[PDB]
Symmetry: D2
Subunit: 326 residues, 4 copies
């Protein structure tokens, strides 16, 4: 059966698309490390993750070939064997390409697509709404996770957009960003499970504990124990009213993220989103994300140190929380 918002809870981890050593070279044709892909999936399931996202920005949806995408998703689906829900990503330059990709990946066995908007031309509100309506009409069995990334996709996913999305049954969740208007968006869109970024989960769950039961994590790719402990401790906090431990975990997470952005600058992070994320994962040692596919295969060396330091900090959190999970 198609996933609903009710079925979206806990720690939703966004995995990279592991690269072979030659993946930066435009001459290379099959650059997905399929075995590393399988290994990551089993490790996430074993850690107790609730669901898997993939194929956003750092997941290199932009720079994988179609055959690579099909092979990656096939490997994921075969590994999961129905044990947890899985979202592919099918953001593309036009509605027809999105539909083509979405139908094929769902057919292979993804449960849904994490889906941004076509971005060559900046979409307006009615265009963006009709785009998601078109995809849901065309592929009614796909769940949709709204990939609300204004830097990548130009459109800024405003309040009235969320009100419209809540009328589309297929739209069950959102990879959400800053929580300044989460309170209102929750009211406007009762049928969506809004996923804050892991660092914001603490605050969001305190805003609305009934609705905010899940979050998205990239930090888990440096070791998932931290995300699992946050999940578990927030459940306990909601029951006991004692938020101190959840707050301590959340504060540790923000510190670990503190060096990721070049000079603390998000616009600079946005330019190097792929390389910085993959470098941090490589430095953490929990998985091998590998080289970036062209064109986004060059990152200023000085920016790499901050990403690597963040990776080490998250690895240290994973060690610490692994022990607290016993």
């Amino acid at each position: 059966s198609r996933l609903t918002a009710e079925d979206i809870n806990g720690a939703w981890t966004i995995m990279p698309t592991p690269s072979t050593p030659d993946a930066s070279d435009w001459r290379s044709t099959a650059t997905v490390d399929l075995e590393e892909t399988a290994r990551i999936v089993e490790e996430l399931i074993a850690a107790g993750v609730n669901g898997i996202l993939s194929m956003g920005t750092f997941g290199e949806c932009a720079t994988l070939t179609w055959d690579e995408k099909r092979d990656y998703v096939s490997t994921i689906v075969e590994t999961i064997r129905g044990r947890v829900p899985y979202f592919c990503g099918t953001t593309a330059l036009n509605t027809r390409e999105v539909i083509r990709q979405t139908r094929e990946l769902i057919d292979i066995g993804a449960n849904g697509t994490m889906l941004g908007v076509p971005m060559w031309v900046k979409m307006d509100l009615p265009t963006a709404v009709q785009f998601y309506r078109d995809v849901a009409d065309a592929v009614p069995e796909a769940a949709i996770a709204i990939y609300a990334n204004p830097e990548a996709f130009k459109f800024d996913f405003p309040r009235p957009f969320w009100a419209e999305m809540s009328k589309i049954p297929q739209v069950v969740t959102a990879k959400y960003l800053g929580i300044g208007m989460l309170d209102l968006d929750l009211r406007l869109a009762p049928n969506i499970r809004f996923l804050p970024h892991e660092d914001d989960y603490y605050a969001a769950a305190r805003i609305n504990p009934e609705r905010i039961t899940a979050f998205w994590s990239s930090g888990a790719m440096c070791g998932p124990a931290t995300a699992i402990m946050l999940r578990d401790e927030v459940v306990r906090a909601k029951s006991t009213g004692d938020w101190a431990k959840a707050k301590a975990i959340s504060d540790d997470m923000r510190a670990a993220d503190s060096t990721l952005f070049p000079r603390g600058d998000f616009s600079e992070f946005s330019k190097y989103n792929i390389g910085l994320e993959k470098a941090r994962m490589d430095a953490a040692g929990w998985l091998k994300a590998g080289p970036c596919r062209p064109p986004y295969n060059l990152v200023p060396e000085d920016y790499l140190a901050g990403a690597q330091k963040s990776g080490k900090a998250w690895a240290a959190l994973h060690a610490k929380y692994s022990n607290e999970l016993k």
Copy 2:
């Protein structure tokens, strides 16, 4: 079939749309190019005396055509031209490998070059953008490249040092250029590129540097090419005689015809509706049938349409006036 150089790029270079069938706005439609209208436009342009044809930029719907549509369009163009004028396809895509794949196939069909922007899901930086064009030229050495310098679409702003680097790539022979504020410097930085100003700026640019600025790009020609042909011819005469009055009068007419195109005079608003507004203007002018916009960019606020249609009628009026002078 030896590779175009900047020396071969002169006069009026007209950018043609990709004509749509009546059902082209519907995501269910699979073969939406009117191939006969495509052939008719090409022959008409050749008959008008155009120097070269560009295609498959933003309003040309490079973003929203399917690959089979693209191949069919280019095939029809190549068969129609039968080597009589140079022809640039467009192969801007999400990643370097896809660009290369598309560029190889379209050049193989018989385009002379590609009008090429940069991958834009993630904003490129300077060295990434340089290496991208180096990679394409390395991979498809037989393709001429026209730099499609559109910062609104592609995020990257095509700065001074970028032009210096492009001038070292023999395949890069021209640029679909925008504002001329830094044209004087860019000409010095890139001696081996024929910079094409937009037609409305050709008068000013040709006066800046009459030796280098011998060509321009025209979308207004899709409303009747006589105006562009007369501008071209009169600028040649002005360069010889030193009497720029007639060239100036034509150029001023062109700016007036463009004056209602932008919604509330706002370029950011034009950028969002670049496809629909251009196609609507052409439809209003009656010289060709551009037809409906492919999804998702198939909705334009009604009030913005009037300005585009008025511009189309103004350009049609120019074409009638200048037809009588040629």
Copy 3:
């Protein structure tokens, strides 16, 4: 006598306009403050039970008042308040020396602090912004400072490390804050500041950190303060009982009342017409007379005015509803 601290900043902090005479849009006019309306507003706010008064931000026309107008306005406010609640003037200006000059005079008249943005002709960077506030606090050590964190007006975006630096400055006691996306972090970075969310965000912010988030800033109160007072009171009760449903209902009402204020829902357009839109809404609500805008910001597209006036009527309706629930 002693300088305000964060501990003294609680509850509903209402930001008042600078009432205009009928001729206030004309550059020829010289004394455009309705000083009696100013006095009447202050007494009405105190009577409603407001905890403190802010003034002289953007809609308060700090940019467009003359210096004599500012001195007369503040004098009237100080003499009306008679020490009963704390009061912040505003002294944002083009340079540090002018800020200091204005701050010293208005504090001397008897304001307790200044609600202060940064000089904005040139976009400030982080170290220059920090040193600016250090310089003002050094020069006028008796002034409390409310950081006026408005990136649209002031260009500087008031980032995380800025708040960490401000928390080392004893004079910096509060902030007129905006979106709460990084409030959790900012609270950790700046233990010594009372961060004031906008009233519509107070519900969410108070649930994030009920210990720290005890106060908020209100412009809706200028359309009738009962709603803000009710929100204040009900959030105190929610923190004690754990039952947040009534506070949530009031907060939801407030957001609905604000829903038509921004032209086509666009904040960049709101930013251009911040003064005229706020003053028009207050005029429509009928609780006070904000009056015409001082030049140059005395023209607002007519279509944008209806949305502001509708918001003013919605807030007036809330005030009537909550007045009855208070009493």
Copy 4:
């Protein structure tokens, strides 16, 4: 005696800084203008053969001077010039009434006009900006106005229809203009304005429209004016002979000298440090002493200073080269 018109605006128009005393970065300092260096600069510029003097834009620290400093600076300039060349003060301020007050006093002291941007705390729209300049011209009919078209400082972007409206205001005679992308159209829309391109763009602009483009604005001249004077003279000759090669060579030298000024080639970064970078370049060139920056804009990242200093040296080298060619 009579008000300047566009017809009177020709040649090299040099924008001078406001020379600082050594203590000028300290907010405690009250009289930070080096009035003798001011007088020296003015006489040097006149001696070099400059056609007019502009002052009190961004790097000229209109935003950070006190009023007494501004009056003293302008008084010194007026008494030095003794009517020999036209002089524009600058009176950009936060509101129309302040602009008018300042403009009346500085024109009264003896400036011929004001180089005037728009109030920028709130981003102006088109009709507001137009009415602002109408208001100033109505209030101070004897002042010539130079439109200071700086969208980074003033937020408003000075669009095509704005120039059409300005051409109906007789007092508006010139513009300190930026990029020339739409100069061709703006010239058509505003026949009564002498558009001043930046010196590096003068070559291109003069080739676009040699009848209209007869003047330019120079900051490079503050590193030695010979280059600007030679550009001016050689462009006159080019227009007569049709031989543009020498003008092109001078213009290309100017662009090279500017090539290191912007931090990492980034204009947004230049905009933040516009004051410090310009003053540092002038200090490095050695032709005049611009001196420390008034607060708050008194801190520039050290790495950015080297690029400004290198530009100053390059301009000084051009001044030496062209001094010899004028002889």
